[PDB]
Amino acid sequence: AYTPQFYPGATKVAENRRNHLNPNYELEKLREIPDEDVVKIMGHRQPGEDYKTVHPPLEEMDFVEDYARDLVEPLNGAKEGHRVRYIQFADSMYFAPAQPYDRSRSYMSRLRGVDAGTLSGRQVVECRESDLEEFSKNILMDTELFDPATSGMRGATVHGHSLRLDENGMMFDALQRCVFDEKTGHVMYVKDQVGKPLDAPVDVGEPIPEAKLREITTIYRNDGVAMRADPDVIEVVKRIHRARTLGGYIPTNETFKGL
């Protein structure tokens, strides 16, 4: 068949982007945050109650016979009619292990039935609540995709992806949802992602050391690794741009001879 190559380039950042894009690549496990702690950090529901429902379970409701719709297996949260909630992150520009477009591409190539959006300041995923919690805890939190110092889960007032880190190597946060504790070195979350305070702070673990961050980040930087050091990615980008321009002008094989 066809063996995918995900991204171009031979630098370390290109390899990390390929690993994030690759669904057969096992993300390294770094933390162990229990499901209740993650659920209470998201702040959508209290751990212990039943899932709220936005529409009756798919078995109860009746649908028209659609052959091309019923041959795609739905998520477990979809057949239970669970409501669609979100998890949102801000990734620092200083060697955060995951980056907005990288996160969106990896999520869309790894998860089923998710809605991913990317900005400069934040990246958000929306899915059914049960599936969202499951994949969030299993992939987004206790893997290399999350750094408690350079990445924080923020639902509103996202600001600090481009600001300088503070004296603890920690991202700026206006609401101060997560706090660095000096007497242990651990980072503790004192509020939910929206900003509502928690009853008890939840420990998310130690921050990743900077040296490790350098070799697992997916961002090109003049100090870490420059895009000038990966000419293949630039060449591919220029080829895509030229192909777009030629197709916009006249979409024929003769025009594409000047590719």
Partner: protein, 442 residues
């Protein structure tokens, strides 16, 4: 005749219908079914008789939240629906045997009127149907219930909302699939002003049929806008054939191959099929081992990518059973495909930009709304020439009820009236039939 490439034809269930069909057989300029659909969409008008009765009984004329005390008429339109329909048919009939029909819908609660084509031959545009039906309704209501001469104004305001003052039928009880010509955002955009919800409700939430309806409308519009002439015609012909009628069973094949898959798996399937069919070849191998691809057939590659985009939307929004993933899927299918192959996206990035704006205005405060309120005439989704709306229709068909602005909320009268015609309800099979009819003429 001028295009040597043939296509196969598969139904909505993936069964073969015919092979070696010329590409031009599905062309809007040749296919009889597409011509019939365009002719019938211009002359069919939906009438809300119950809405008229309710508006007149409470004096609810004037649009949103507006009442005129004293201008209240107590009529029984729904009970006398047969008489009203007979009078409207008599008024609109041209000679004796024209295609004038006024069928009763929902026990007289709605009317589906079709003005004769003879009334549209001598008309420059399509607005004659709505105005003629409005006048016929006014006369029928005035003559059935002996309405006073000083209340014909109230009747007119009940049928059309504020038309002389507002160049539209906003508060009225008369509707059509196409919008008013004053709402067009560009020249030739008349056929692009059909919202996604209207297309989904017309096809009764059938995914493949909704895709076919939306694609046929969008590509016929591109023909009308002058975009699909000259060297741009083959690209749109292939886009309609592959993304919209699953010519080589590409859409069903990709969905079947990715029943429990993600968007990336659909991208991989699309690239594998394109390589197997010879559409794309390896241009060069880079230093890092990246295999840059080039299209051996540019338009065929575009068609393959569009079919894969429809399949990816179907897979993702069927896994989620929610129609809010459409914009993300359309964006990231193209985004992953381009940097996996080095090839341009579905519409040379024009579908990606439409998906970006769709994501923006479907997730922010600046406008837009649910995916069902967008159309090809919308300022946000007008940018891709018929390659982005059929996926939106498929996704809204796959929805399980997580959207408030669902087809039921938005298109109740239009959907119920236009679902009664087999050509509008199942466009896919009738377009295939027309292509089969004109198969041997090329």
């Amino acid at each position: 005749v001028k295009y040597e490439d043939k296509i196969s034809l598969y139904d909505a269930k993936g069964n073969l219908v015919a092979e070696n069909v010329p590409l031009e057989a599905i062309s809007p300029l040749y296919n009889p079914t597409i011509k019939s659909m365009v002719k019938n969409i211009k002359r069919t008008v939906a009438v809300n008789l119950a809405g008229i009765e309710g508006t007149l009984a409470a004096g609810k004329i004037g649009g949103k939240g507006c009442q005129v005390p004293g201008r209240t008429l107590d009529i029984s339109a729904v009970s006398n629906a047969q008489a009203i329909a007979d009078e409207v048919e008599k008024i609109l009939k041209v000679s004796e045997d024209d295609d004038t029909a006024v069928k009763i819908i929902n026990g007289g609660k709605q009317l589906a009127v079709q003005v004769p084509t003879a009334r549209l031959e001598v008309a420059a545009e399509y607005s004659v149907s709505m105005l003629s039906t409005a006048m016929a309704l006014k006369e029928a209501l005035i003559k059935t219930f002996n309405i006073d001469m000083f209340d014909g104004s109230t009747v007119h305001a009940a049928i059309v909302g504020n038309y002389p003052q507002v160049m539209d039928y906003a508060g009225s009880n008369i509707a059509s699939l196409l919008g008013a010509p004053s709402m067009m955002e560009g020249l030739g955009y008349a056929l692009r002003n059909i919202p996604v919800n209207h297309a989904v409700a017309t096809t009764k939430k059938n995914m493949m049929n909704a895709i076919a309806f939306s694609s046929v409308m969008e590509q016929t519009a591109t023909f009308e806008m002058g975009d699909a002439v000259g060297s741009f015609e083959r690209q749109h012909l292939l886009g309609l054939a592959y993304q919209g009628l699953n010519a080589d069973n590409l859409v069903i094949d990709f969905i079947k191959a990715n029943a429990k898959g993600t968007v990336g798996s659909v991208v991989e399937t699309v690239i594998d099929r394109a390589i197997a069919d010879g559409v794309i070849v390896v241009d060069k191998t880079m230093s890092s081992g990246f295999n840059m691809y080039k299209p051996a057939d540019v338009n065929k590659w575009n068609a393959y990518a569009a079919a894969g985009l429809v399949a990816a939307v179907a897979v993702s929004c069927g896994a989620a059973r929610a129609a809010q993933n459409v914009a993300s899927v359309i964006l990231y299918f193209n985004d992953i495909l381009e940097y996996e192959t080095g090839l341009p996206g579905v519409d040379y990035g024009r579908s990606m930009g439409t998906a970006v704006g769709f994501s923006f205005f479907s997730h922010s405060i600046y406008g837009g709304g649910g995916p069902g309120i967008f159309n090809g005439n919308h300022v946000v989704t007008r940018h891709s020439k018929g390659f982005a709306i059929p996926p939106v229709c498929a996704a809204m068909c796959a929805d399980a009820g997580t959207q408030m602005f669902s087809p039921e909320h938005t298109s109740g009268l239009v959907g119920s009236v236009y679902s009664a015609f087999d050509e509008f309800r199942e466009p896919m099979k009738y377009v295939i039939e027309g292509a089969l009819s004109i198969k041997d003429q090329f």
